[PDB]
Ligand binder design. Structure first.
Ligand SMILES: *[C@@H]1O[C@H](CO)[C@@H](O[C@@H]2O[C@H](CO)[C@@H](O[C@@H]3O[C@H](CO[C@H]4O[C@H](CO)[C@@H](O)[C@H](O)[C@@H]4O)[C@@H](O)[C@H](O[C@H]4O[C@H](CO)[C@@H](O)[C@H](O)[C@@H]4O)[C@@H]3O)[C@H](O)[C@H]2NC(C)=O)[C@H](O)[C@H]1NC(C)=O
Ligand SMILES: *[C@@H]1O[C@H](CO)[C@@H](O[C@@H]2O[C@H](CO)[C@@H](O[C@@H]3O[C@H](CO)[C@@H](O)[C@H](O)[C@@H]3O)[C@H](O)[C@H]2NC(C)=O)[C@H](O)[C@H]1NC(C)=O
Ligand SMILES: *[C@@H]1O[C@H](CO)[C@@H](O[C@@H]2O[C@H](CO)[C@@H](O[C@@H]3O[C@H](CO)[C@@H](O)[C@H](O)[C@@H]3O)[C@H](O)[C@H]2NC(C)=O)[C@H](O)[C@H]1NC(C)=O
Ligand SMILES: *[C@@H]1O[C@H](CO)[C@@H](O[C@@H]2O[C@H](CO)[C@@H](O)[C@H](O)[C@H]2NC(C)=O)[C@H](O)[C@H]1NC(C)=O
Ligand SMILES: *[C@@H]1O[C@H](CO)[C@@H](O)[C@H](O)[C@H]1NC(C)=O
Ligand SMILES: *[C@@H]1O[C@H](CO)[C@@H](O)[C@H](O)[C@H]1NC(C)=O
Ligand SMILES: *[C@@H]1O[C@H](CO)[C@@H](O)[C@H](O)[C@H]1NC(C)=O
Ligand SMILES: *[C@H]1O[C@H](CO)[C@@H](O)[C@H](O)[C@H]1NC(C)=O
Ligand SMILES: [Cl-]
Ligand SMILES: [Cu+2]
Ligand SMILES: [Cu+2]
Ligand SMILES: [Cu+2]
Ligand SMILES: [Cu+2]
Length: 559
């Protein structure tokens, strides 16, 4: 609950809590709990926002997206998920939420829990809002979120720039007429398709029929508006821009950054940007454009011009008349110019490439299916019926190869990870790398070159050590692994648990592109509460009893 957060002073929140407070170690004791109930239903022949009827969707509370989770910094968010799907299990992951000492609430099936069984199965997630900003939630049951088990999270807190109006969430996502499981099967043997449409705040116009509506945002003239842009896609990576307006970035993912004014922004899958838009221009209707760069290396749409309308209050209605100029090609790369308000400093001169800190991503075309993504020689494949947490609770350390366990025993120390993007492979694609449970520091990446150029880079200490930044580098939960290159990340081992580190392109994580950071396993067992242990076991017993009756097999990694 705020006491000093005003339009002119957004830096202030409450006594002892402001924009400069280290949120990772200090949290407000509000004593408030915001509760929600997620009823997942399976709807056939559902009328979508662009007029096209989809074969099957999986919705939360009968809507395209679940409810917008709204709470204050320090509150506890509680969500009861009731799975009323016909066959599918489910697990809701709270993307961007660190789950500090609450690993069993991460929603990663086959890792932190067993899937919640269908036909009425339930589980109540409970997590502390130790970070303020814009995040999202989604199913981690294969590519199930591609069917509609998605939604947004807005944890209110201070900001790095004053603003008058909080316009709230603005989720932008790719939209396919085909269901997630059919698309997983397709992408296993074929190149990923372009999206049928791109929804902005749950709506879009059909490029063929003209049906549906554009997202309409009403701007109040002369005011500063906070817009929370999210990319909730399964594959599409977006470039966003507003005609005749600049966007001032105040947050990258769920991390507050110093004000950074730009003309356009690149949002990888899972990325978020809180921007401040000043309604400083002439009263008119302006196009908010969703474009693609990187020469289709990180997505495209069958809708050539996905857009939303930004209407100034008091101005006339109708469609905007200025098409604008195309934004700069971001080349499937997010900006490394963002600088977090609360700083972090790490040495980069001491980094040495070793097998134990290197994660080689590779596309294996030799097996069945054709598109199998391997990290350090193995495509991830979890056991929905026997999660990593079960191994921890039973004292079993014989983790199967397919779980891609990367055990990190270091206590509260900075660990360095070099991710290589199939340098010696036939072709390489950009990958939006996401980490559960932590925000990582983006120390550096291979030279920014055209995404479709097929130019390869292997980490060379002689020229690359000088290119790394350890003086308050970008801190976030998702960043781009350049096509054919490399990426150097670092995260402090302050959160014992089993944490997935994967590409957020649904087709790739389904295909096996992931590792599981088993962080401080010895400390994790001590921190698991009896309530969390009993409930984990309850859901697992219910899932294991359900599984043999399921008429469909597990066709992918399960993530
Ligand atoms: C979670 O819940 C979802 C929703 O029900 C399940 O998704 C279904 O999964 C099944 C099994 O994988 C899919 O069935 C298979 O579909 C293949 C493709 O068919 C689609 O595409 C073609 C071409 O566009 C269309 O003509 C067709 O109408 C479909 O849209 C078929 O090739 C498969 O056939 C073969 O296998 C079956 C099963 O063994 C045999 O009966 C056949 O004879 C043949 O050998 C098969 O039918 C289904 O398409 C998926 N539906 C959706 C909506 O995605 C998930 O499986 C479930 N997940 C779990 C783990 O429970
Ligand atoms: C996007 O949403 C805004 C806000 O709801 C819409 O703005 C509204 O536009 C209508 C016209 O379509 C305005 O109506 C007024 O009607 C009278 C009588 O016909 C006319 O004399 C006025 O000039 C005006 O057109 C209304 O005032 C306006 N509301 C605000 C607060 O600005 C906008 O139309 C929507 N855009 C789309 C494409 O849906
Ligand atoms: C931002 O989004 C808007 C809205 O989707 C885009 O406007 C669209 O612009 C295209 C051209 O770039 C228009 O299509 C063209 O129409 C002419 C007809 O004269 C035709 O000859 C061309 O072959 C092409 O089809 C389209 O009509 C227009 N949409 C609307 C409703 O105005 C805009 O281009 C986007 N801007 C950027 C920078 O991406
Ligand atoms: C990737 O797999 C390789 C095995 O091919 C791992 O390399 C071994 O790592 C251990 C340390 O745990 C060393 O004692 C061995 O000497 C290494 N063998 C090799 C290949 O030289 C490596 O740890 C794995 N990388 C990660 C981060 O998972
Ligand atoms: C979930 O929603 C469906 C459809 O509205 C309804 O039939 C069912 O009773 C609901 N289940 C629960 C437990 O909320
Ligand atoms: C997004 O859509 C919701 C529901 O239609 C609406 O209430 C909200 O104002 C929209 N957000 C913006 C910024 O237009
Ligand atoms: C330990 O885990 C392995 C892999 O799942 C399993 O084969 C073995 O039976 C387990 N040991 C026991 C009985 O706890
Ligand atoms: C954008 O729109 C304004 C409308 O007031 C137009 O006059 C202006 O020329 C446009 N901006 C530029 C310079 O492209
Ligand atoms: Cl996360
Ligand atoms: Cu996610
Ligand atoms: Cu996540
Ligand atoms: Cu990928
Ligand atoms: Cu994940």
């Amino acid at each position: 609950e705020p006491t000093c957060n005003t339009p002119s002073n957004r830096a202030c929140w409450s006594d002892g809590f402001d924009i400069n407070t280290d949120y990772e170690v200090s949290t407000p004791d509000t004593g408030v709990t915001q509760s929600y109930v997620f009823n997942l239903t399976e709807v056939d022949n559902w009328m979508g926002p662009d007029g096209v009827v989809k074969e099957k969707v999986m919705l939360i509370n009968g809507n395209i997206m679940g409810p917008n989770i709204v709470a204050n910094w320090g509150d506890t968010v509680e969500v009861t998920v009731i799975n009323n799907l016909v066959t599918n299990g489910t697990s809701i992951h709270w993307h961007g939420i660190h789950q500090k000492d609450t690993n069993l609430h991460d929603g990663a099936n086959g890792v932190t829990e067993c899937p919640i069984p269908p036909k009425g199965g339930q589980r109540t997630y409970r997590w502390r809002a130790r970070q303020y900003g814009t995040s999202w939630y989604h199913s981690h049951f294969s590519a199930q979120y591609g069917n509609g088990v998605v939604g947004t999270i807005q944890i209110n807190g201070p900001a790095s720039l004053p603003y008058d109006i909080d316009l709230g969430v603005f989720p932008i996502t790719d939209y396919y007429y085909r269901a997630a499981d059919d698309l997983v099967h397709f992408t296993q043997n074929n190149a990923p398709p372009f999206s049928d449409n791109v929804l902005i705040n749950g709506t879009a116009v059909n490029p063929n029929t003209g049906e549906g509506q554009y997202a309409n945002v009403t701007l109040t003239p002369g005011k500063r508006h906070r817009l929370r842009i999210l990319n909730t896609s399964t594959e599409n990576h977006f470039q966003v821009s507003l005609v005749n307006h600049t966007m001032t970035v105040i947050a990258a993912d769920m991390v507050p950054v110093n004000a950074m004014t730009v003309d356009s922004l690149f949002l990888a899958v899972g990325q978020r940007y809180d921007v401040v838009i000043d309604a400083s221009r002439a009263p008119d209707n302006y196009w908010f454009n969703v474009t693609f760069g990187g020469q289709a290396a990180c997505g495209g749409s069958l809708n050539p011009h996905p857009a939303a309308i930004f209407h100034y209050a008091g101005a006339p209605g109708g469609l905007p008349t200025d098409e604008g100029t195309p934004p700069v090609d971001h080349q499937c790369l997010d900006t490394l110019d963002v600088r977090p308000v609360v700083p972090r400093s790490v040495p980069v001169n001491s980094f040495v490439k070793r097998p134990d800190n290197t994660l080689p991503v590779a596309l294996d075309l030799t097996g069945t299916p054709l598109f199998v993504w391997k990290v350090n020689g193995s495509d991830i494949n979890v056991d929905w019926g026997k999660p990593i947490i079960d191994y921890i609770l039973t004292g079993n350390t014989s983790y199967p190869v397919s779980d891609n366990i990367v055990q990190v025993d270091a206590v509260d120390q900075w660990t360095y990870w070099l991710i290589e993007n199939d340098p010696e492979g036939p072709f390489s694609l950009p990958h939006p790398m996401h980490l559960h449970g932590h925000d990582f520091l983006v120390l550096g990446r291979s030279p920014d070159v055209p995404a479709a150029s097929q130019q390869r880079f292997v980490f060379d200490p002689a020229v690359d050590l000088a290119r790394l930044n350890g003086d308050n580098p970008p801190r976030r939960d998702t960043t781009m692994l350049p096509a054919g290159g490399w990426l150097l990340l670092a995260f402090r081992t302050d959160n014992p648990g089993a944490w997935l580190f994967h590409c957020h392109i649904a087709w790739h994580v389904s295909g096996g592109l992931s590792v599981d950071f088993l962080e401080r396993p010895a400390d994790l067992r001590q921190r698991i509460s009896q309530e969390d242990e009993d409930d984990f076991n309850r859901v697992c017993d219910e899932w294991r009893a359900y599984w043999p009756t399921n008429p469909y097999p597990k066709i992918d990694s399960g993530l």
